[PDB]
Symmetry: D3
Subunit: 314 residues, 6 copies
């Protein structure tokens, strides 16, 4: 067992953090650290930085690494996102993760060049995995990449890279089932992570997931934790917990579905604003903004969810 | 605000009326008016005539306008359907609607000629909208037409046509979400209408709809109203109402699904017959009829729904 | 044999005529008759009126019948299009065709109401076929209608309706193959008609077609006739004719492809204008018009085709 | 009525039996008979042998017929599966079924040669049906076969073959709806059978099914029977039964979904093993086996279902 | 090199033989041998027996092996088809092939049970390959099987089975390109075989194929050989040969396309009949027959091809 | 007219240059400039740098700008590619293009963040266009981006950005037709560019293209120029040129098709190597390499094309 005696960095409820943007459009790292600390205190187990929720394409590799360092310095368990323009850059994020003392590695597929090519993905994964060989790793899988990591690739990688311990799935319930049935269900150290906000109950109950990366949990941490706890109890055969998890998931479905689309950072930042956190007002691109109707729509759905939850929870 | 002080013609529960057919296959307008009056008295807010439920392709433009006049004369709030073989005919339905004192306009896409062409749809909508500029209007959207009205078109039309106040969606939950997110959720006079019998809870709860056009509500008015009232309460955050709305919707799903297919008039007329309204026995085409198995199937599903509802409702 | 001793109305090259529109937007029937007479004189065998090329949805049933009468009175062999808003109207076009002395009937599927329902299409076809039992008939088949007439339906109809002698196919080469293999290749009176401008060589050579309805042949009658004659010779095993037919078809492909889309009347009218026939300038809907780029594009493709043909033909 | 006074062989809950495999990889018929007897005693109404659950492709026609005979000799009502490499072999299974005294016939489409050809399927069905004209028959319908039996074929067959009394559907809820609406809902002797483990509630409640063939019911007979009884009560309008049926179906969904895929025999045998029936350890092909992860996954889902059911059921 | 000094059994033009059927519907092996001898004498290099062209599903394993033996005894180089109901039966065809002295092995994917499962296909291929380890082998690839052999599988098999020397592709030009680019183009003993009648020019010219299995070449051996010789010359950069190959392929396309569909044996037998070989009149299933229209269609296309070729060839 | 008196930078044949990689994996700019100079001397009109052919994702923004400067300094007309990780970076490429004296701008859609969102693409295009307002610009359109620039967007941009003069299309013949019909065929300064190696004849002849960006033209400049010259002559109605262009295009089709897939840089570099230019041996990622079979396949297709062309060209 790679992590030995310590509880896995890939278990529990883990927010993918947004990167607060100043008026000058540079990242507010004090605010990032504060939010990170707050979310751990609410019951989250770790954070992910800097992933797509954190606006990685819009920040330099150096900005991201400064962020990671600040979060790690502050005592927050960090899983480092390695999304990058090229392999060399992904690799440098992983080197830095190990150097700085991050607790985990999120290994993202190659983009922009040969993205569909399985042999190129294998070499890219291997480059990243061997760059931080002491840091436990998950592979991120998603239909977005034009490519799917299957059992044969996963285990070929794991044969050479013992730090590969998990699989994070973004795609639908069917893709999750495939991963649970064929990759993550041996009696071993390999675990499945839920990787989209809309697949919580399916992941915990039907797929034996042990952890979940959350976008909406930045905004509704207590409520998302409550869902995961119901799901976990349901996964032990608790009938009442299963029924309650399904209702809470249904109520949370609209707001969670923003995670599935291209505007997830715009939608989740604006919800942070509605919760009163005005550091989430601006975007790194000056012209990126929800429209009037989009705003109206989130406002109504956020109001409806909080009203529902207040009623349902007692 | 276009309608000013009066409650919107596009709110509440609105049946699309069927046109009763005599033995000589001409329309029974006394029966249409009687049914209209009855449905308003059951709690419906307005009616639609003459739409696809009313067999518009099978009736002359003149027959339809006689119908509209009778309904309007009788005190029933009428939303006029403008479905037509060509723009000139659609336009004449709209002129007549304004002349006669109808309360609303359902603006249907061009058919048969250039149906997929967005520029032609724009000109057609504009022709209809400006034909009845004093009558509040909704655009009907449906995958049937080979074409989708998007936010950019809707608002370009609205810039020139202030009577355009609503959007009615027939397509799936995804198409409804798009309309709610991008068209109907500004803090303005623009509202979303549910436009298929199977999308009630999603429309009210998830999409902020304010009204619903109903086919099955001709047959089960009290029960469909009950669903809409549960949904409306659910949309305010009532947990118990949400759970009850989902069960009633599930129970009503088979019968409502007849609205989605090509035989909706055959299925809904025959249900009217089973409820005891024998003016709904015949069709305008002599050869149009449910088959023996189709009849058996509606009979069993109608029996099952009424039995279920009697049990569930107390 | 239904037509007995006379050559089939469904053989040869047959234009679907456009309906010239006056400044007052009413049909110019003198111009329609003149064009009809001209096209027969160029080598066409018959005409179709009033089909989708003739703007049927935009004209009243009465306007169409006046047109048909004028063409028939003038000595032009006419195949009557029965496209209509309903069965009763289709039926009245067929009654009128027989009354007036038209030579053939194009039987169009039911639209707008139950269009996908095979049983309803059967009853509609039967209604039309028995309305003009003395007039030889073809069924029009197209993916547009949401429905396909298959061998079993065709032959069930033919068992009761001996005037059904042909099958006209608009869909792709695959749909044509199905019709040739399973419907039209018995040693009988049943023939296949080419029903889209882009399928000439395939229809004659690969599918044993005996006639072709043409849109672009209104504009380029000599050149389309030349293609059909090459194809006919190719269908007898002439190697040189086959090679020449393929080159002419390739050269004609862009211009012919306008037949496949929603703007065919706009594109073919404008080509008539470019050929110098200014009676084809206007459309029945005032707002229907090719855009500036569309015009530029037809102008360039028309120039290129005529230049090519002048060079290629000697 | 073909079966006259006796209750239909196609009603109730009917397992498709697996064929236990010895160490020498020959079938254990004592074990098959014992399991059959046990399942009837648990409340099952009949069995199916030898279908795809019974590994038909892996056993000789003679092995299958020995099995059928043993089950019939033991007093178990048997529906004989006629899946075969060719029509002649299918026919010999049907001759043998009638000879031996089997109570029903499952008529499987032609495979391997002309599988998509409706005319060939008709002749094949007719061959099988007339081979055992005294034995009540159902046609098996499935997207697997590249082909669908529609109402017109079903009833053309039934006109000549009065022993055809039922329709078994494997495909989705939509395919079941089509069969219920158009084939099985006349007031006649014709019934619908549920033919995939995942469509129980839909089949009984929404489609008027009267019987269900089950794979998972070999393993969880009491629990599957409990679902069918809830569904049957729900189909009479019992609101409480409907709600309970939906929860039990949801809980059973993962395990039932193994029926939908290519590994159903591997998954259901291994569950039999986990229930303690070690005669289900081996497969006819030596190399056919669940992987380590697949095993882990069934183990966890089986544990979770039993835990859930123990809690939910009181 | 596995075949050492001898020319590969997988090069040249190779008919998949049909099995002539007597009046008693048993195979006519004298006629099979005679046809085989004739085709070798016309320039074919080998034959395939018993594949789908030979009606394998309709014949017992023993009938097939008798056929193979007769062909081998007569001096004809035979590639044995291993299509079968199960692995054990496929394996026995391969054992028999080696025993009897067949020159090659066509390795067909598992059907009917686990057909889509790559791991099961691997084990099946391995079973067959090791059953006849002295006989050179190709793997048959086709979209029919619900499964594709990719480079990784091919080469994993080849590492353990040195008799695997070729790849036969039935699917489209794209699937052929994949095989040429990734499997068959190393400077090694591994060759690509064309495996559908419609892909000859693409296979030889664009994909570096070295041999072709032919259905229509049973009927038109000289003409198919002529195409392959043009293609082979084209593949060496001969411009004139390339242009001629494309014309002959186009002329042969309709007749060759019968190979792509479910009726290939019906279509190719009937062509054998039209060529005057009346041993090809009947089918193993009494009810399998081309319809009247299908017959008419082949008759016309066969006439047209022979007429064309007589003209084109001088 | 934006470019005034000078010939458009977007006409003629324009290679997208590859970036030669040293043993230390840094770019060889001397070699890039030399190749650029050579290609202009062979008849190319301009070059594109740094696009996807130039490995843009693998090079820093600074490396790219050094390249652009070197090419511009050397007298080569350069169209600058603006593909980038974010808008700010795209913008800096455009600022630099104008500063340095590049002759044109290739405007690439936003990637990685909001790629499918049309409103975000509009703002991105506007940012780039206004960054280099003096430099003539084309928008690159491709299905890759999850998004299509349509006529309405193009012309809305052009209303504010007079330097937008062209449209470059990568997608299929259908997407090219749409652009020719609706965007580029007004009598204005707006031109269509061919943007994939496989669409040359269609672009020039059928779509009125005036220029072509080429990948394979780096390798076969004379032969690609010869195709474009035939196509240009064909576009003036030259019959002989049209026939010759089609044969040369067919011969070049395999090699050109490498442009359509993910390995285009690997395939085109290796062809440069086969032509004897060994500066194209290595890749920026050490592990990126054609496989043995891929190499074999390009070697055979390159040999076949040169042999064919030597024969065909006299
Ligand atoms: Mg990456
Ligand atoms: Mg595990
Ligand atoms: Mg309309
Ligand atoms: Mg609004
Ligand atoms: Mg019609
Ligand atoms: Mg015929
Ligand atoms: Mg069978
Ligand atoms: Mg029945
Ligand atoms: Mg096999
Ligand atoms: Mg090789
Ligand atoms: Mg970009
Ligand atoms: Mg222009």
């Amino acid at each position: 067992y790679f992590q030995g005696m310590t509880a896995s960095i890939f278990s529990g409820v883990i927010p993918a953090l947004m990167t607060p943007c100043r008026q000058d459009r540079t990242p507010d790292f004090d605010a990032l650290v504060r939010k990170g600390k707050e979310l751990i205190a609410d019951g989250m187990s770790a954070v992910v930085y800097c992933g797509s929720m954190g606006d990685w394409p819009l920040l330099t590799d150096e900005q991201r690494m400064e962020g990671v360092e600040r979060l790690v310095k502050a005592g927050i368990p960090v899983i480092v996102g390695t999304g990058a323009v090229n392999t060399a850059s992904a690799v440098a994020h992983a080197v830095h993760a190990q150097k700085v003392g991050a607790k985990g590695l999120m290994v993202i597929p190659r983009v922009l060049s040969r993205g569909s090519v399985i042999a190129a993905q294998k070499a890219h994964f291997k480059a990243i995995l061997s760059a931080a060989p002491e840091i436990p790793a998950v592979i991120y899988n998603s239909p977005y990449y034009g490519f799917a990591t299957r059992a044969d690739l996963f285990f070929a990688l794991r044969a050479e890279h013992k730090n590969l311990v998990g699989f994070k799935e973004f795609g639908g319930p069917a893709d999750m089932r495939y991963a649970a049935e064929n990759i993550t269900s041996r009696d071993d150290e390999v675990t499945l992570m839920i990787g989209v906000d809309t697949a919580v109950v399916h992941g915990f109950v039907n797929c034996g997931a042990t952890g979940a990366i959350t976008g909406i949990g930045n905004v509704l941490p207590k409520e998302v934790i409550h869902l995961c706890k119901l799901s976990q109890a349901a996964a032990k055969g608790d009938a009442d917990a299963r029924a309650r998890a399904l209702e809470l998931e249904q109520a949370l479905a609209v707001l969670s579905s923003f995670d599935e689309g291209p505007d997830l950072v715009l939608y989740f930042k604006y919800m942070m604003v509605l919760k009163g956190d005005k550091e989430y007002t601006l975007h790194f691109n000056e012209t990126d903004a929800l429209t009037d109707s989009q705003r109206g729509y989130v406002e109504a759905q956020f109001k409806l969810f909080n009203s529902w939850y207040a009623d349902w929870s007692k």
